[PDB]
Structures are given as C-alpha cells and as structure tokens.
Nucleic acid binder design. Structure first.
Ligand SMILES: [Zn+2]
Lengths: 197, 416
RNA sequence: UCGUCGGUUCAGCGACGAUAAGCCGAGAAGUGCCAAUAAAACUGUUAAGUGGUUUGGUAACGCUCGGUAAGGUAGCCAAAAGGCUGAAACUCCGUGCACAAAGACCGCACGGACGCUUCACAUGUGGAGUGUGAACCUCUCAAGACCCACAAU
DNA sequence: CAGGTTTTTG
DNA sequence: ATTGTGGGTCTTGAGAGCAAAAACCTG
C-alpha cells in the first residue's frame, strides 16, 4: 500500500540547496544503517576476541551511539533508520551465525526514512499539492537556516490523484514514508505509505 | 599462459559407496559455503574495526599487532579451522583466499555503497588445489582421479585410509586434454568439483594452464545474425540465424504456455511455495541458456577460423555498451557479452589481437567513398550511397567500415 | 508434444517413460494464533496523554531440504568360500587386456576393412583427420534490467 | 633418515 | 497496461584459476 509521487520543485527553497540537503541526509541515513548493523552485530555477541551494558535492547544502544554523529537527521527519522537496520539483522541473525548469508548491506542511494509525524499533505487552491516534510533536527535548522517543515510541490495524477484525495479526505491514513532518488530518471520521489480498512 | 577449464564426469568412487561419497561431498559443500561466508564476515568486521580505530587514533591498525596475522586471511583460517575441520586444509585455505580476495578487491565499492557485501550460495563448487588432485591412467583404459577431499580428523572419522579415488570418464576432446595433462604439456591449476543437477552428475572441472596489419570487421547485422568483412580482400562471410529464429519461436510459445498454465491451480506444484511452480520454467530457461552458449561457441569458432583462414592478425568489433540503447538486431535480446568474450579468448588463443570500436555511424557511413549520411540507408536490407552510387548489403558495408583501422576516430572527424 | 540413457552443450539416431506443466515426505525464517506492550519521538511547567510496536511460545496455508518413470546385460562348478566362462550402448572383423547386477558392467589398446570430410597432384591417385554432425575456459559474486504476489487505476 | 601429505601462514 | 511496494530470475562486467615453510605420517 505505497504510492510514488515525484517532486518538481521545493516550495520553500531552490533545487540546489534542497538537493544538497537531501544528499546530506542520504549520507547520514546510510552511515546510520551501517553503524546500526555493526552495533547489532556486536550486541549479539558475534564479535571476535579482539573486538555495551546499560541498554535494554540493541535499538536504544545503537540510537544513543549514532545520534551524536547523525545530528542532521530528525530524531524520529534516525530511530526509524536504526530500527530498519536492527530488524534486518534480527531477521538474518541465524543465517549469519551459520555462515549462510554473510552481512546485510545497504545501497548508496538509500531511501530517506520519514516517520508518520513528519509527513503532511495539503492542497492549494492553485491546484498544486504541497507536501510538508520534517527532514532536519534543531542543530540542522540552526546550521542550514531552514524551517522545520520543508514544503515541496508534488504532481498528483490519476491513481495517485485518487490516493492523495483519499488521504486528504481522511479515509486513507498516512504512515511512515520514504524519499528516494531515481538516477535513470534523475528525479526525487516520495514513497508515501497509506493504510485503510 | 592461458587458463581453460574442462569437466570430466565422476562415474563411481573407488573403495567407497555412492551413499558415503555423496554424504561426504554434501558436507564438504556445507563447510565450503560456511568458510566463504564467515571469511567475508571477518573481512567486514576488520574493515569496521579499522575505521573505528582510525577515528580514535588517526591511523590504520596493523593486523599483525591485533589479529596476530599479517593478513586477514590468516586470522580467517585460524577462526574457520575449528568448524571447517572436515575440509582439507589446503582446500579450506584456498576457499578463504577466494572470499577475502573478493572482499578486498571491492572494498571501496562496498564502503561507498556502490556494491553489496558478497554472499555465497549453497550449491558451491568444492575447491581443490593443484596438489590435491592427481590423475593416473590404468592399463585397462580407466582414468583414476585421486583427490585429497578430507583432513586427517575427517579421514579418521569416516575411516578413509588414503586420498579418495574416483573413476573419471575421459573421452573425446577431454581425452586429448587429459593425455596432455598426464604428458606434462598441460599443468593443472586449482580445480573444482561441481554437481549438475539436471543429470545429477558430479563433475571434476579441471582448470589447466598452458602456453598458446590485416583486420577483420564483424557487424551484428539486421537481416544476418553476424557478418564478417575483411580489409585488403573482397572476401565475405556471414552467419544467418534460421536455427535461432526457429528456436526463438519454439521457446517463446513454450514460455507463454507455461506462464499461462502456472496461474491455473495445481495441487502438488502449488503445495510448495518456491522451487515448485518454478522448476518447469527453470528447465526451459536453462535450455535456452545452454543453446545460446553453444551457438556463441559455434559463432566465435567460425569467426576465429576465418581470421586464421585469411591471416587477419587483428579483429575489430562494435563496443556494444552504446548498441544496448538501440538493441534492434537480427538476434533479439542475445547474449552479446558472452559472444564477445568467446571471440576475445578464442582469438587470443589463436594469437589475434581484438579491438573494440565505437558503433558511431558505421552503418550510415559508406566504406568506399567515406560519406556519412543519416538518410544514406535506403530500405531495411540494401544500402545505396549517392556520392558514388554504391549498392551493397547493409551488413557488408557496416562490417567493411568496422574493418577499417581507426574508423571510429575517422568518423568522429568527419562528423565535426 | 516433452523428457531419460547412450562422456560434456545443441541437433540427429537407437531403445525407453510420461497424469512429470505429475504425485508425494519431513523440518523450518516469513504468514496466522496466544500472551506481550520494549526502544524511540512528541504535546504538555511537570504530571499526564498520544502516535509508535517489542519479547517468547505456537502452528504449517504459504517456505527449506528432499523422494518419486525412463537403454541392455551370457551361466555353471564347488558343502560353502571361492573358481571358470565372458553378456550387454552411436559401423564391421581379428587379437590382447579387462569385467557375475549394476548410481559403480556394456570398456580400452592395436591392426585391417568400410563410410565420411579436408588437402595435395594428374573423374582418378596420394596424404591427413574422425567414427552420427557441430562445438567444447568455467566458476563465483555484484550491478543494471526482467519474473511472481499486493494497492490505486 | 626419506618422501609425500596435511597444516598454517605470508 | 501503468505507477509504485514486498519476494525471486536475465544480460553485463570483474576477478580468478596461491605459494612457501614446517610438522606428521609414513617407507
Ligand atoms: Zn559511396
């Protein structure tokens, strides 16, 4: 239950600065996934002889270790990223121990996670659908000098138009989403996930 | 010295039943896969630890001080010997070398996210170093392969007194290669034991190393599958695809029928989620792959044969990296990379240099008058040049252009 | 019409099997059922309240390893063990070396004949190669694209 | 001792 | 049919296809 909408322009700012922000957040998300995999590997005791107590589960330890380095990402987005990595490791731990599948890996052009609280959509009278995204944390706001909710214009047509209209009406409930980039089409897209009865 | 591979079927084990030999081989496959995956895991842990140590101290940590071994492979072997004791130590060492070399050669790509960390599959070939294989010809004509497939603890456990001996069917071209191996003309390199699941046949892929002006032009034509034209000689050669088009029609009809029937309900087929509902399609797909492989062998052999026939010491052919965009040839969705690699290594055996050129308006250009026109091509088959009124098959003109030395640069100059 | 064996891949040929696009068996990460609400993020002076959905145990619809039809084979002696003989697969003949059920045997070597296809020389002669024909570096991993299930249309 | 055969490591 | 999402395969490429010293078994 996911639909992809491509963004023609960021409403608040230009394309160059928005793309710089997006690629910085992509780098931070990739680092978070790799570090969360390393910390889940250490947590399970799979580490070698040459290679931390105080946390109930691996997710909290990984988050509290990584959040210093990934200060740009919104904390909820960082938690969702780290949870994704630790879920993959918990799903593949037995195969890792048996020497079946080696180590989980994540692509350079990684999706940017967005918790349900960081996504909103509204419709201007002009006819442009505007998506408001909480992409950055407060130190990132101070450094980049940008507002919390970045607004982007999304083209919404056909089945996508029906889905977005159902979201606006309240029938479709938004959930955790992603911001991906397609190199072949060289376009930034939002994968919005929706749930309903 | 080139390296080639020939497979000899294992028909029976000597002094062992087939049940015991099959169990031994399946187990050794399990430790082979375990060793590969865990060696990759150890390489990855060392990468992460080195990054963290560089962050803390500002320099790379030496493995000799921390791991105890100057290389990651030593530590990997030390860790794996405990749980891969059944594998012969040389085979285990070479398998771990495979895994760690693959990780090391591609470390930057994995670090920057270009490439995933390698993962190895269950049906993995059993590695055998050169010393772990010997072959002897009996007086009554049989060929016996003595393989060190087991370690001393494993030899004691299954009560295998000496190297495991099997009878290998050595026939045809395999007979000539094996006789050259025994004579010492061929040297055996690291080889493998694989299992063809279609025929349920175990093969010993012996890898053996050995010491092995005019330009041909090859054009992947539109009406002819492949076409060869030579410089300094009006000689013409071609490969049509009647077998390809007939086979293509048959396998297209079969895939459509299979995919249509797969949606219809089936009890025993649908009971199992995967490897059932998939076996019939995999069978036909493997048949198509084998046919394409054999056809590419025949084509590359014909091409190189005519290269020696007319003394062409160099072969030029289109770099398909750009052709992939148009993909409108007589061969539809063909394994062009396979065919090109076959042509390359067979020519290199023959002693012929292979050079790839850009397919930059080679069909549009006239090989006689050197005139490039977008509208020069007239019709789907023929080619007519106005500047000199040259009438020839389009494939012939394209291959003649390809055979011209530095033709891509000349075309680039003519464009600008 | 599709497969099996006849050394490997694609065709042919011989002999066979097809309900195999078929049927069936056990273990197990997804999916479902129980408890069970852990990280993390917020609003809020705090409190408090939300979204978020974790940890073990189960089953087996889906999942993982598997099984399942397919060429043909000569008998005696000896208490038994063992011995002798020497059958059957893609031309035939002779010799020699092998071999008593068998996933494991039907083979190999030499000589001759016959057939084929390549060269050379004046249809014929000589030389060469081979026994159905053509070929016979593969393995591994990744990337990009393709296949199956799902939502909107 | 002698010679392969594993084993371990660069 | 077309966009995606969740699980699996083609065609392209790349790398490889170890070596040396010593202890153990054997002779
Ligand atoms: Zn012309």
């Amino acid at each position: 239950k996911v639909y992809r909408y491509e963004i023609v322009k960021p409403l608040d700012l230009d394309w160059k600065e928005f793309g710089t922000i997006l690629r910085q957040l992509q780098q931070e998300t990739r680092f978070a996934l790799n570090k969360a995999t390393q910390l889940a590997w250490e947590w399970m005791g799979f580490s070698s002889d040459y290679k931390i107590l105080g946390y109930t589960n691996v997710h909290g330890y990984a988050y509290h270790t990584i959040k210093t380095k990934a200060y740009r990402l919104n904390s909820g987005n960082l938690s969702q990223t780290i949870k994704r990595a630790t879920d993959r490791f918990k799903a593949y731990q037995k195969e890792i121990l048996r020497g079946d599948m080696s180590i989980p890996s994540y692509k350079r052009d990684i999706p940017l996670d967005l918790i349900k609280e960081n996504i909103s959509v509204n419709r201007m009278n002009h006819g442009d659908y505007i998506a408001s995204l909480s992409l950055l944390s407060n130190p990132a706001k101070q450094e980049m000098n940008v507002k919390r909710k970045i607004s982007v214009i999304i083209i919404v047509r056909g089945a996508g138009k029906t889905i977005m209209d159902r979201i606006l009406s309240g029938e479709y409930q938004v959930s955790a989403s992603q911001i991906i980039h397609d190199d072949r089409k060289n376009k930034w897209y939002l994968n919005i996930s929706y749930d309903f009865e | 010295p080139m390296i080639k591979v020939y497979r000899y079927e294992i028909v029976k084990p000597l002094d062992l039943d087939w049940k015991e030999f099959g169990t031994i081989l399946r187990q050794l496959q399990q430790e082979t896969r375990f060793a590969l995956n865990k060696a990759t895991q150890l390489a990855w842990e060392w990468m992460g630890f080195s990054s963290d140590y560089k962050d803390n101290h500002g320099e790379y940590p030496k493995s000799k001080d921390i791991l105890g071994y100057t290389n990651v492979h030593g530590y990997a072997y030390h860790t794996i010997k405990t749980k891969a004791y059944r594998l012969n130590s040389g085979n285990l060492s070479q398998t771990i070398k495979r895994a760690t070399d693959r990780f090391k050669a591609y470390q930057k790509e994995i670090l920057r996210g270009d490439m995933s960390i390698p993962s190895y599959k269950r049906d993995i070939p059993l590695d055998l170093i050169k010393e772990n294989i010997s072959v002897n010809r009996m007086n009554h004509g049989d060929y016996i392969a003595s393989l060190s497939l087991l370690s001393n603890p494993a030899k004691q456990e299954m009560n295998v007194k000496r190297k495991i001996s099997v009878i290998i069917i050595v026939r045809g071209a395999g007979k000539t290669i094996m006789d050259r191996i025994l004579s010492g003309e061929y040297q055996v390199s690291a080889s493998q034991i694989i299992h063809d699941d279609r025929k349920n046949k175990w093969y010993l892929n012996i890898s053996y190393d050995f010491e092995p002006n005019k330009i041909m032009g090859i054009a992947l034509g539109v009406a002819v599958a492949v076409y060869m034209a030579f410089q300094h000689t009006p000689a013409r050669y071609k490969l049509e695809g009647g077998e390809i088009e007939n086979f293509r029609r048959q396998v297209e009809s079969r895939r459509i029928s299979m995919l249509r029937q797969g949606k219809y309900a089936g009890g025993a087929r649908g009971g199992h989620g995967r490897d059932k509902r998939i076996k019939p399609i995999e069978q036909l797909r493997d048949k198509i792959a084998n046919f394409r492989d054999t056809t590419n062998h025949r084509y590359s052999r014909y091409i190189v044969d005519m290269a020696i026939k007319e003394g062409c010491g160099t072969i030029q052919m289109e770099d398909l990296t750009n052709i992939r965009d148009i993909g409108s040839r007589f061969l539809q969705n063909w394994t062009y990379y396979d065919l090109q690699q076959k042509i390359i290594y067979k020519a290199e055996e023959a002693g012929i240099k292979v050079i790839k050129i850009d397919p930059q308006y080679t069909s549009q250009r006239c090989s006689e008058c050197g005139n490039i026109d977008s509208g020069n091509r007239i019709g789907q088959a023929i080619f007519k040049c106005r500047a000199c009124g040259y009438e020839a098959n389009a494939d012939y003109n394209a291959a003649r252009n390809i055979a011209i030395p530095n033709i891509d640069k000349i075309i680039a100059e003519s464009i600008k």
